[PDB]
């Protein structure tokens, strides 16, 4: 299956209170492997998966160097954006950046991407071709003309194809027993009387990885898109994910309803019905 | 690993 490596960064100003709060996390697929927090003791990039602990001091030095540089670029970006939008020194604002790599089954490059937001709204992103930027407003156009002049996209493309992918390949080998494992969902179904005439049927997927899943209900084969309560897919806390889908149904008409479970780790899609 | 030459706005 495909794999991704993705870095997420958040910087939040706090006039009066010091340097902005800066938080960085790295992921391979749905698994966190690295962390940096600007208010923590160490002032280092820190390990968050067993398989990254194997890297030596030359790696943590490099990753600490660069993560610090990202935090310093956000510090400036906050100031610059404050100026372009004419906002006051006292208010508190946020930048967010996410970039990374995808690869296919073959582990060859598939797509790369880099997105950026100020106060939760898109500011600028790199297009699919990794050669040009899409720009939110007149402030983003300014930044795009500047980055064109400075060959920024070209530098980032080199990384996105190339370096990013090579590290993703290495993390996937070193961490083979957790990253290349696919846990299929353990399923079950539940039934609650709502007073007279109606019952809830709730369909569960627990203990699965990766987080991608589709859970649907059908009555007599026909999809219940409108009627079904879904919950956002959610972390269990142990590397694995949980999800459920509920539907309300008329009493004694529950055999008509069937729950459909799709996941990478299932050979074929699962079908379940109420078995009292 | 992280990209090195991350650019400012």
């Amino acid at each position, epitope marked *: 299956g495909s794999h991704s490596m993705r870095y997420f960064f958040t910087s939040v100003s706090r006039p009066g209170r010091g340097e902005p709060r800066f938080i960085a996390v790295g992921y391979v697929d749905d698994t966190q492997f690295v962390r940096f927090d600007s208010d923590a003791a160490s002032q280092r990039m820190e390990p968050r998966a067993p398989w990254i602990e194997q890297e030596g001091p030359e790696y943590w030095d490099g990753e600490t160097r660069k993560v610090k540089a990202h935090s310093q670029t956000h510090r400036v970006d906050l100031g610059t954006l404050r100026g372009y939008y004419n906002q006051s020194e006292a208010g508190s604002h946020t930048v967010q950046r996410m970039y990374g790599c995808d690869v296919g089954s073959d582990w060859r490059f598939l797509r790369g991407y880099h997105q950026y937001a100020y106060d939760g709204k898109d500011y600028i992103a790199l297009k699919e071709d990794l050669r040009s930027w899409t720009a939110a407003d007149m402030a983003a156009q300014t930044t795009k003309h500047k980055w064109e002049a*400075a*060959h920024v996209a*070209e530098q980032l493309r080199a990384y996105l194809e190339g370096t990013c992918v090579e590290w993703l390949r290495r993390y996937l080998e070193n961490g083979k027993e957790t990253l290349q494992r696919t846990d299929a969902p353990k399923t079950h179904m539940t039934h609650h009387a709502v007073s007279d005439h109606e019952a809830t049927l709730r369909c569960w997927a627990l203990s699965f990885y990766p987080a991608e899943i589709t859970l649907t209900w059908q009555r007599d084969g026909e999809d219940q898109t409108q009627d079904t309560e879904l919950v956002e897919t959610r972390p269990a806390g142990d590397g694995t994910f949980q999800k459920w889908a509920a539907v309300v149904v008329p009493s004694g008409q529950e055999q008509r309803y069937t729950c459909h479970v799709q996941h990478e780790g299932l050979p074929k899609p699962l079908t379940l019905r109420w078995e009292p | 690993s992280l990209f090195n030459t991350i650019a400012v706005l």
Partner: T-cell receptor
Amino acid sequence: KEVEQNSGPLSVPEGAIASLNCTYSDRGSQSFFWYRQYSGKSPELIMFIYSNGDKEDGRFTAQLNKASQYISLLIRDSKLSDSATYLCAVRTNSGYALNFGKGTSLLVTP
Amino acid sequence: DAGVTQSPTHLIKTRGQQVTLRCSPKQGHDTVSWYQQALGQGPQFIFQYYEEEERQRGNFPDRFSGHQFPNYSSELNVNALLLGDSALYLCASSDTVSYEQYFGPGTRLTVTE
């Protein structure tokens, strides 16, 4: 020994194409540059390459091959003004320093 | 409103002495990298400074130290001078957009007997 260039001098007849090669060992090498240094002076950026392939700028062509781990500079229509030391520099993804070759001296023989 | 600056232009010192080299970056530039270029050799990275701290350091001994001030200018200090410290000391400035390094005119240090 991380970035390798021959010292030369290398000679190229005036008007002819001059060829300079440079070799590197670190697989994380990401960004490549060629500097020119005239006798008694400091180095001057003349070309950057961030992408595998050929890159043309005026009389200069740079060629990068990251699989074979070389990088070349070709100078068409050589002038006497082109006689100088050419230094090859490389930047890895782990940081912000340049690692440089020792410099190949070019003499364009008139 | 112009290019990279270094002083002094040339220095003559004897063994065991101390020197301070100054560098100012180009006008849009906020990072400064020092290099040592020995005769017939390529520049060897000493340090890079950004926002007044040492971002990265090379392979040079404790004798070499440095600093960057609020106006982004920088100093290289080297102590306990050896004859072998004779070199062109090059300062190079970069911004944080393109990251290309542009070298200054250099201080030529000679350490003599």
